[PDB]
Amino acid sequence: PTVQRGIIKMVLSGCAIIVRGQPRGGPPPERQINLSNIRAGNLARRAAKDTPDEPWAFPAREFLRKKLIGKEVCFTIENKTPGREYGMIYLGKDTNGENIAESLVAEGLATRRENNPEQNRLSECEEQAKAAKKGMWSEGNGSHTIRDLKYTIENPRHFVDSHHQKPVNAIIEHVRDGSVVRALLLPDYYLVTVMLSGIKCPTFRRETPEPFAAEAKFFTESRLLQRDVQIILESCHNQNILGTILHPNGNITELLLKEGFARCVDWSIAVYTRGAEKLRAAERFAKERRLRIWRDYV
Numbered sequence: 346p347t348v349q350r351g352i353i354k355m356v357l358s359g360c361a362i363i364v365r366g367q368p369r370g371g372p373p374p375e376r377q378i379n380l381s382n383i384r385a386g387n388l389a390r391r392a393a394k395d396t397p398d399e400p401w402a403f404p405a406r407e408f409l410r411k412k413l414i415g416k417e418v419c420f421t422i423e424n425k426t427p428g429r430e431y432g433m434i435y436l437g438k439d440t441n442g443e444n445i446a447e448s449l450v451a452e453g454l455a456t457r458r459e460n461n462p463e464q465n466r467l468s469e470c471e472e473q474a475k476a477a478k479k480g481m482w483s484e485g486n487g488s489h490t491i492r493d494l495k496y497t498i499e500n501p502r503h504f505v506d507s508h509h510q511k512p513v514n515a516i517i518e519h520v521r522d523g524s525v526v527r528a529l530l531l532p533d534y535y536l537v538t539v540m541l542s543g544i545k546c547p548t549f550r551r552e553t554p555e556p557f558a559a560e561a562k563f564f565t566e567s568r569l570l571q572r573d574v575q576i577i578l579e580s581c582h583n584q585n586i587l588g589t590i591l592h593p594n595g596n597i598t599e600l601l602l603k604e605g606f607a608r609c610v611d612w613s614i615a616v617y618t619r620g621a622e623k624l625r626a627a628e629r630f631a632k633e634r635r636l637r638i639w640r641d642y643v
């Protein structure tokens with residue numbers, strides 16, 4: 346196996362993994378690896394109609410998300426189908442470390458599809474999980490693992506008022522641009538768009554985005570994609586919620602400005618709970634240092 350290194354970008358539906366390199370010249374390059382010998386539940390999706398989570402789809406996602414997001418991994422490409430790639434991923438710098446599929450199957454969160462030392466480990470992992478009755482081998486149908494996914498809040502005003510600007514636990518599921526996200530609100534499972542109050546990063550269009558838009562996307566995306574966070578629901582604008590993300594490592598709204606990836610905006614600065622004085626001040630910090638969006642050649 347031609348072994349390769351990477352960083353976990355995200356865990357997808359069916360526990361396919363997105364792995365990215367270090368950025369050199371532009372946005373980092375990404376690889377979608379599907380875990381080779383194993384089957385996991387497909388998450389909730391929608392198109393002609395809403396289809397719900399399969400049983401054990403979401404608990405599997407969470408398991409690997411909580412273990413992997415932003416770890417350095419290594420991976421092999423067991424095959425390439427006619428442009429999907431199949432392979433193994435190991436937590437750590439070398440290939441004798443934790444095989445993630447083995448960890449998956451061991452919790453009862455995945456099973457093998459319809460031999461060798463690798464597939465012997467997985468049968469062992471499957472039989473340990475089937476004997477201990479973990480995950481989908483547990484005595485049940487699994488219905489309690491399926492989320493009541495709501496893709497629209499019925500009345501945003503009431504819903505924003507209901508929480509009284511008290512931080513709602515949340516997972517960030519997608520970053521459209523540097524200052525708007527898709528976030529999964531817990532414990533209800535409302536999947537909603539959240540814009541950061543008081544800022545606007547540059548945006549994407551057509552075949553050509555504004556300057557630093559991919560930069561700001563990457564910035565917010567590398568720090569927050571598939572992380573547990575808390576979000577202060579501060580107001581709404583149509584189906585979009587205005588709000589502010591809390592994470593231990595800092596305030597993303599506050600950083601984006603201080604690193605010259607965003608500009609203050611007047612309409613939405615009033616609802617910023619954490620203090621409109623401080624956003625105005627961090628804009629000035631990046632301005633005075635002539636940083637990025639504030640360069641003389643831009």
Ligand SMILES: COc1ccc(Cl)cc1S(=O)(=O)Nc1cccn2ncnc12
Pocket residue numbers: 567568569592594595596597598600604
């Ligand atoms: C998990 O990571 C994060 C999640 C959310 C936020 Cl708001 C920040 C981070 S961070 O720690 O990775 N980066 C930085 C923190 C502090 C100062 N700076 N300056 C430039 N970068 C940072």
